[PDB]
Amino acid sequence: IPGIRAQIRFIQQVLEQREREDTFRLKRIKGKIEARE
Amino acid sequence: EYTGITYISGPLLFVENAKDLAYGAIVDIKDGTGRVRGGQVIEVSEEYAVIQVFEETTGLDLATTSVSLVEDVARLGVSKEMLGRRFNGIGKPIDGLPPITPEKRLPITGLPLNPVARRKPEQFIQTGISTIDVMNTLVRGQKLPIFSGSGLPANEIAAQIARQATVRPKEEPFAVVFAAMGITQRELSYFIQEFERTGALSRSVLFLNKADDPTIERILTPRMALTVAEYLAFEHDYHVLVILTDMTNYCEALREIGAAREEIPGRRGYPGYMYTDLATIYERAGVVEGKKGSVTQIPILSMPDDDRTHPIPDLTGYITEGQIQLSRELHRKGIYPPIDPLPSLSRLMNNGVGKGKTREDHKQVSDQLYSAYANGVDIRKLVAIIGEDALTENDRRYLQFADAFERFFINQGQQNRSIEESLQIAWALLSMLPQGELKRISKDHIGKYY
Amino acid sequence: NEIAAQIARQATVRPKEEPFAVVFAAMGITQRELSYFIQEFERTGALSRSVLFLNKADDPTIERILTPRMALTVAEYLAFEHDYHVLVILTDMTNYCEALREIGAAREEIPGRRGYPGYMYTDLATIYERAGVVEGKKGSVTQIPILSMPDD
Amino acid sequence: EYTGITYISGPLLFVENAKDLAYGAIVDIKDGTGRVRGGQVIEVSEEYAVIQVFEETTGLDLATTSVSLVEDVARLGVSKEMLGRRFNGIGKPIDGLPPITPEKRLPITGLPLNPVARRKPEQFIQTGISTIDVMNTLVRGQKLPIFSGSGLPANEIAAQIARQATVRPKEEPFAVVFAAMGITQRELSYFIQEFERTGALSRSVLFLNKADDPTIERILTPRMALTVAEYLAFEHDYHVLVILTDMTNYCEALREIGAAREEIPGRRGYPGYMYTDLATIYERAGVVEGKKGSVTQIPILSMPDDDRTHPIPDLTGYITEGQIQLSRELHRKGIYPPIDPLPSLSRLMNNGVGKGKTREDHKQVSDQLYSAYANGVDIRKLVAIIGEDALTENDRRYLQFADAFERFFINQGQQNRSIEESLQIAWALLSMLPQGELKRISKDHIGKYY
Amino acid sequence: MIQGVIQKIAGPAVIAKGMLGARMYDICKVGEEGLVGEIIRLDGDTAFVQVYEDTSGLKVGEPVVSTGLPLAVELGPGMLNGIYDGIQRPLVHALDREKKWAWTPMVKPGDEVRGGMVLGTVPEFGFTHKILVPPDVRGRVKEVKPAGEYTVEEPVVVLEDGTELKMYHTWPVRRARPVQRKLDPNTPFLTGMRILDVLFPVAMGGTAAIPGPFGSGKTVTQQSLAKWSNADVVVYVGCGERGNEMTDVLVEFPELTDPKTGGPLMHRTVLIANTSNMPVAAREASIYVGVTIAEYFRDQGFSVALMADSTSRWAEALREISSRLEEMPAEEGYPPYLAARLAAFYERAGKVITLGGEEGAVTIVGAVSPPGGDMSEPVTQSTLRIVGAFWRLDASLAFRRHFPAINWNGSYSLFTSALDPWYRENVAEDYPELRDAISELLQREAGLQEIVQLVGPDALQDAERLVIEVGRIIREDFLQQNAYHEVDAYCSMKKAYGIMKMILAFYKEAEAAIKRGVSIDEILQLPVLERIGRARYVSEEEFPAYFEEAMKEIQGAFKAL
Amino acid sequence: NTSNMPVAAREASIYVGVTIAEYFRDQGFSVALMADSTSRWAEALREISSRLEEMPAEEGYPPYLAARLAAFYERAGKVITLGGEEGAVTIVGAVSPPGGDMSEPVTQSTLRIVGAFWRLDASLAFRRHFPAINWNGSYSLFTSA
Amino acid sequence: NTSNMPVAAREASIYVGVTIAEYFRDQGFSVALMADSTSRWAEALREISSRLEEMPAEEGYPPYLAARLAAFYERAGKVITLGGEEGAVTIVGAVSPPGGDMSEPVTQSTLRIVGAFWRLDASLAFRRHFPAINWNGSYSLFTSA
Numbered sequence A: 001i002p003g004i005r006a007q008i009r010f011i012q013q014v015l016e017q018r019e020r021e022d023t024f025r026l027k028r029i030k031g032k033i034e035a036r037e
Numbered sequence B, D: 001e002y003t004g005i006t007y008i009s010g011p012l013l014f015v016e017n018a019k020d021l022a023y024g025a026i027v028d029i030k031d032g033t034g035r036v037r038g039g040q041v042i043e044v045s046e047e048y049a050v051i052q053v054f055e056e057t058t059g060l061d062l063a064t065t066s067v068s069l070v071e072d073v074a075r076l077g078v079s080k081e082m083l084g085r086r087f088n089g090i091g092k093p094i095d096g097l098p099p100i101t102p103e104k105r106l107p108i109t110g111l112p113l114n115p116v117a118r119r120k121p122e123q124f125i126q127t128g129i130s131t132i133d134v135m136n137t138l139v140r141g142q143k144l145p146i147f148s149g150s151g152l153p154a155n156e157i158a159a160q161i162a163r164q165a166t167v168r169p170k171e172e173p174f175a176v177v178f179a180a181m182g183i184t185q186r187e188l189s190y191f192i193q194e195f196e197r198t199g200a201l202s203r204s205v206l207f208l209n210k211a212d213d214p215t216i217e218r219i220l221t222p223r224m225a226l227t228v229a230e231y232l233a234f235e236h237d238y239h240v241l242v243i244l245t246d247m248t249n250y251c252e253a254l255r256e257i258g259a260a261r262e263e264i265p266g267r268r269g270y271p272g273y274m275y276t277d278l279a280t281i282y283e284r285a286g287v288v289e290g291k292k293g294s295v296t297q298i299p300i301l302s303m304p305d306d307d308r309t310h311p312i313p314d315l316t317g318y319i320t321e322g323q324i325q326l327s328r329e330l331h332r333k334g335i336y337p338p339i340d341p342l343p344s345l346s347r348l349m350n351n352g353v354g355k356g357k358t359r360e361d362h363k364q365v366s367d368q369l370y371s372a373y374a375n376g377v378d379i380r381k382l383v384a385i386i387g388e389d390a391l392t393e394n395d396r397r398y399l400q401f402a403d404a405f406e407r408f409f410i411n412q413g414q415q416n417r418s419i420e421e422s423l424q425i426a427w428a429l430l431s432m433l434p435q436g437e438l439k440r441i442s443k444d445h446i447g448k449y450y
Numbered sequence C: 001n002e003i004a005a006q007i008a009r010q011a012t013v014r015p016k017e018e019p020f021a022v023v024f025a026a027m028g029i030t031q032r033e034l035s036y037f038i039q040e041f042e043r044t045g046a047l048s049r050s051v052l053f054l055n056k057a058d059d060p061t062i063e064r065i066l067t068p069r070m071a072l073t074v075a076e077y078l079a080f081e082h083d084y085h086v087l088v089i090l091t092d093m094t095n096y097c098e099a100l101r102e103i104g105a106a107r108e109e110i111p112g113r114r115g116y117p118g119y120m121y122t123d124l125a126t127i128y129e130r131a132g133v134v135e136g137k138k139g140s141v142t143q144i145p146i147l148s149m150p151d152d
Numbered sequence E: 001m002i003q004g005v006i007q008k009i010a011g012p013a014v015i016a017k018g019m020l021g022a023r024m025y026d027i028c029k030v031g032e033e034g035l036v037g038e039i040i041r042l043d044g045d046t047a048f049v050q051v052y053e054d055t056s057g058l059k060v061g062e063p064v065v066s067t068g069l070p071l072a073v074e075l076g077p078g079m080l081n082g083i084y085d086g087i088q089r090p091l092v093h094a095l096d097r098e099k100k101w102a103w104t105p106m107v108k109p110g111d112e113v114r115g116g117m118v119l120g121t122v123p124e125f126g127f128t129h130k131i132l133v134p135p136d137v138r139g140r141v142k143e144v145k146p147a148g149e150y151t152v153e154e155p156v157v158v159l160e161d162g163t164e165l166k167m168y169h170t171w172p173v174r175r176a177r178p179v180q181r182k183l184d185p186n187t188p189f190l191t192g193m194r195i196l197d198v199l200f201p202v203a204m205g206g207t208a209a210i211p212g213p214f215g216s217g218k219t220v221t222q223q224s225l226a227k228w229s230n231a232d233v234v235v236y237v238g239c240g241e242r243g244n245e246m247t248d249v250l251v252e253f254p255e256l257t258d259p260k261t262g263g264p265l266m267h268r269t270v271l272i273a274n275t276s277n278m279p280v281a282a283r284e285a286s287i288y289v290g291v292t293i294a295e296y297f298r299d300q301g302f303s304v305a306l307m308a309d310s311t312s313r314w315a316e317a318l319r320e321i322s323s324r325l326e327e328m329p330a331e332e333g334y335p336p337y338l339a340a341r342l343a344a345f346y347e348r349a350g351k352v353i354t355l356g357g358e359e360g361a362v363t364i365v366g367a368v369s370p371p372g373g374d375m376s377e378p379v380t381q382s383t384l385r386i387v388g389a390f391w392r393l394d395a396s397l398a399f400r401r402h403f404p405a406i407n408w409n410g411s412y413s414l415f416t417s418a419l420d421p422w423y424r425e426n427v428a429e430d431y432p433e434l435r436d437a438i439s440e441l442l443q444r445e446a447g448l449q450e451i452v453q454l455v456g457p458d459a460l461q462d463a464e465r466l467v468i469e470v471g472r473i474i475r476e477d478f479l480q481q482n483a484y485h486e487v488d489a490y491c492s493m494k495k496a497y498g499i500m501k502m503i504l505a506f507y508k509e510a511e512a513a514i515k516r517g518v519s520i521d522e523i524l525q526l527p528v529l530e531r532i533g534r535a536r537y538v539s540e541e542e543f544p545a546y547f548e549e550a551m552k553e554i555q556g557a558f559k560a561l
Numbered sequence F, G: 001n002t003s004n005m006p007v008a009a010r011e012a013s014i015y016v017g018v019t020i021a022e023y024f025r026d027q028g029f030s031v032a033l034m035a036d037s038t039s040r041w042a043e044a045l046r047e048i049s050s051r052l053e054e055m056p057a058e059e060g061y062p063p064y065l066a067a068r069l070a071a072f073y074e075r076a077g078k079v080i081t082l083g084g085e086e087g088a089v090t091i092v093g094a095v096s097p098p099g100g101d102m103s104e105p106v107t108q109s110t111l112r113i114v115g116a117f118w119r120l121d122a123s124l125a126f127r128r129h130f131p132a133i134n135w136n137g138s139y140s141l142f143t144s145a
């Protein structure tokens, strides 16, 4: 059961990894289009 | 009147006229080309210059090259004889037959005819698919999208509806308009063969746009299709079903030119105008004046990257009366059709069901199956959390009901289920649940139908 | 805001040789909220030892930006020139920020994270820097800023 | 010929010439500066103006400031006497010795010599490290990256290979080119001392670029190193081993200027050109014409943030013939070298092993150890799930084999293992497994070698 | 100034050119220095040119000349064993002008011909080259060479009393070669690899995407296919080369052998390199040059395989050209135009009835290399939407030493039903049922392993342990194939089904024995199992004998009870 | 507010409606103003702004939107009309984010003004729980009032 | 480096200090440079960069930071001063992530440069174990040195 929270925890952080950082290469690209224009 | 190119950047060409400027939307013809090259006026830049968008490649254009104004936009050669023919995105023959002999020549943007009535969609369209007809009924005048993703058989469903759809005893004749956008040569050959072999072609107009056809021709494809549908419905009094695959591919082309047009991009790189262009297509549906005919749409919306929140599929939802959402996860479990029973909705479902339409218990059965399937799906999560043996007896029944719903109700061995057949399967699977747990079926229906 | 109003009514500096005052500033509030705050200060007699600045939602955005600066200047004056222990209550800093953010676009700046002004932290620093003991050590400026979580 | 600055924005300076425009890539010199300030021409803007990139800070520049064209870019003072010297990223002495006396002066971009043959990498390079020589053999002409992360001893491995590498009985002489990029003063002093003390310096050319050296000098470092390697290999017929640490640091500098160059950024903020610049470095390896010499690369690729999917390390994989991937998790378990036995591969391994190269059983042993170690590592997960006592007898053997592989095969007490020594350890640990469980070793090898 | 022009300005990678009044949009232009460029922008007072190389070799005032081509290719004897680049030319001419070829007349004077008709044969390289009337040419053969030896430039025939025909012909790589019709996917492209041929079939003239992260084995699938697939000719566009992947193929492949004949594989191959020092233009055109050459060989009546290393790098080269042309960037800064183009490429794939009857085909296998695991844009996303087949190399399957490392859960073929009848009629009546049954096995294993990940394996019933046992045998004995073994490097269709039936027969017997209370531990150590494990290494049908060996052995387990 | 109508008209539609709404409350009536929706009104306004070359910000929306939208909702309220008598305009505005993102335009700026939010929940709907209002994510500022 | 001070001054503060530090080591003194902290210096620099419209990256920080921060720490070291004699500048830099995340700016880039890290552990502190330095998470790449 603390197996659940365990490896499955790795789960939430590859998940979370994936995008507050991915979602950001992006708010900033679009800036970048007419941010650059 | 004639003009001269003053600038060329990819699909965007500027053209200066010394006399008479062509109005926005006019089709201009480039002189000196082996194949016809159309330029559609998009803007008046000032100084007698207009900005245009090419309908084919601009390689080989030179500054100073001559251009004539045709005096009108692009158009549909409208006739009842459109039925039985296969055409390109622009309405040119693909079936080795002669060009259409027009009864009328109609503009294609939606301005022609002013066909729609201010009346609500109503009455049945029998698709011949149980998961649509029984649980998410398509109604005449409705826009009911197929919501899917890459790899899923959305086009097989679209083709099957095209073969099977009818308007059961209607005094009005029925027709199909099938438009495909950005498809491969293999897919085009397949669609053609299917319409010809089945004899579905007799009551259909088919428009096929290939992946390598000009991007502008793809943009015009849905407009040719909707104009033909409105003509048949309004001037011939027909119930017309329009099937458009894939709206996402249409969007990829429209998006492709927005950059060449000088716009600042919006979210996800899309055109800032995404929703007001898409509105020009979803606005074109409903009962037509006279109430003899109607235009119904079944647009296919594939999720790019399977993301139903992508701006394209997300903005399409508002244009529909019924939505059928397909899911890769479900397809990978071998459940076909791969319809997500908790994300498919009928906006106008209540207008096409009940006594005198389907059967009096239809809403109650639909509500109970939806509720039980949703609970059963959540319990699949709970089983994973606690283990199968730790589930209560009551929850185990709901868990099992979800499998029964998928195995017996969703799955059809290709097979035309009447609404009576579909309600019968529904009641049969419902028996798996405790009668005391049928919260959404009034006792009157349990006694009469259980 | 109930907590902010309650502190405004109740705060004191228990045996201090220095007089005590409150500066209460509200930003981007409704007419209903403004009427409520007024009535509360007047009825309780809290108004006798307070200066109150009220900025409405429909007041100019620039007036909202100036509100906390009017409030802090009054506090610094009372504390330094009159030797008072002054408590400044600013609600809501998030609403102040929504107005400052609103103009950053009209000012020609490239936006920073979440659409905010790139200068978010160095404008906000001009407000949080203004607090502490004043020269002479008879008075002081204390701040209780309200920070509502946007979207929690 | 002289020009005048017309604009300055950070590293980018525009310069107008009244007579003779300097061609792209020419080095220009800014007049009126205390220290030499080079401007490299990047573009011709039109109107007799060029756009340039500064090699040092532009603070203190004024519009109108004078600039001269040197008449050329920058290049390598090529000579066999490069061996035994320590130089900067630009090839200037760091060892207090005189500047190189060139036999030839070579351009450094890769255009000079056209040295490579259209022949496959082949024959053994003895690194003296068992985990490379035995299981992931380095071959002459191959690109075999060390795949690591911050905190791991990748540079210790790189330095050890530099000290130990040879080409066992080859008629050709052997040389090392060691290039370090963006290193600290402490690291530079350490590398120098190591080469000098061991006598490794006698057969090596060393290029050291410091963290505070100009970013442009860092970009040029790998090009100076590869040009020296190609010269020694092609004009002197040598088998040359090039060690480049760290490619990720090279990338941080190249990325640093992409912004100043006006490009729209790509994923993760990187330059859009990441893969076609990196290709200019990984393309430079293989057998040279004549087949007397060869250029082999061992690039170090540290994972930024330990992420092997970051665009830099991820694009480097295709440039290699052998990859050694280091893992922080493994290092934290005290297993050194911290090589991930299920993520280290020989792209070209099969070309450097077997009878007449290593030994006939090498592929079978490598396959069996890899399979058993991977199973053993998964079983560490299963132990955590079920408990040690619930593991089967067979699984317990595989669990134990993973520890044996780490303790005895991966771990070396610094020590130059011959391939025979490495295969012997491999067979010794394999004995822990049931003979009936050696699925990947043909019976012929079991009888002969077990 | 119609055919030539002069550089106005250069820097920032675009050359602005005065003149070139007749140049076409997207035409190759030539600078005096010898560099090539592409006409991107046509303006009223200049042409903007993308330079396919270093622009410092270009100066203001330099002369520029038209080539008249988006591009072209030479198509005749001398193509085989040849190594070209992005625009066809020895790794400069294209086809040897000195080499003599034995021309054999296959038409007499007076015959009426049409484009695609075969007038002669040349044993240039066994292969037998088929000389065809260029597309768009018909009439009566008024003159034809006798059986002799001639160079390419020589005229072998005249039609309609004067069009002159040679042994070669030119064609715009940008324009797909004409054909009467494209046929429906019917015949499988026999790979010899069990997982592919069985579960994720590729049809002759099918488009099947190869996608996955860097170092997953994408290229290797392609190379094994070429060494062993049932295509006569291979067109390898070894793009995304770097560090030394160029020299890795330069002097290496010239030694790789044709498992079928024992001659060099290059003897039936055409290489199209795409190195980093090459302009984005050339790499962009490389797939079009290759596909055209591919279509050319299928026109002869050959089944050719087109292997595209990769399209991710082609879309990056195209994005570089587009951004330099100032076209509006979209998602990941890619131009809007890419999806329609990429689709148009894959559409040129297919098995056809060539001009003048006869059947041929071009099967495409494209590599997918996302920026890094993201598996979005460019490559993957757009590709996986076109292609009918996807073989997902799985790094976790690879680390686990399961070869081929193809994920039987994430891979798919839309061609399974399209090719099933070819297998049923020519190989085995139970091909489709067998692969469906194996896939259901693998599907069940996946579900079981997910649960075991939670509640552990101790509670597992014998029935579930048996399914994992057989599922494992499928993965190790079937899915996994050794590309390095002299035998298992290629698995003939006949061998693929026979191994499948040994595994499926062991499954039925396993489930049957359990149902009769036979300990699974007794089945797990059954002697035949070790033989089933080495079956992929047997080159003789001794493999189907294992079925009877399996049955009797289970009987010996029915005996002991 | 149809798609064939200029961005201008749809932009003005909420102002024409609110004025008509204020007109009826002046009589001493309690009127409800239902705004389908402001997401589309902000898209029509962004089209007009971009055509006027005003500097794009977040999601390319003009800087001016937040103050304007707030000014609209400020015209809501129960008043003592000219010449005594009480009337009121209650506003219910629809929120349609570009797609679940629930950021800009619509949602973000709106949820900051409005005092009440009734969150229809698609999961509550699929579960056949009607009204599909999420009792955990919805809020009002009036319970004590 | 107070909050009322421009981002510019705080940015330059480490450079002014290091120069003064290098000045004293030139005399033949061993000086310690203690930098409270670089997280705040990178926030002041991000403010200046965003105002200059430089392209934001991870956490909206400019691309230029990693090379700069490294260049700073490179000026540390024990040297043989001009005219012989030995002196040194030892740097101890404080790390303050936005909040426990311990990513960017500060920590991430710093822990990659520095040779030593003394991890104060809040759990070690709560347990009253002083100094609260975690002997399991701290490291000195100088032990052998």
Ligand SMILES: Nc1ncnc2c1ncn2[C@@H]1O[C@H](COP(=O)(O)OP(=O)(O)O)[C@@H](O)[C@H]1O
Pocket (backbone or CB within 6 Å): D318, D345, D346, D347, D348, E213, E214, E215, E216, E217, E218, E219, E220, E221, E403, E404, E405, E483
């Ligand atoms: N079928 C295979 N069998 C064994 N190893 C393989 C196989 N495919 C790939 N590999 C391993 O992966 C390495 C990289 O494979 P490759 O196909 O070249 O990568 P990519 O997907 O980048 O093209 C190979 O050199 C080999 O070590």
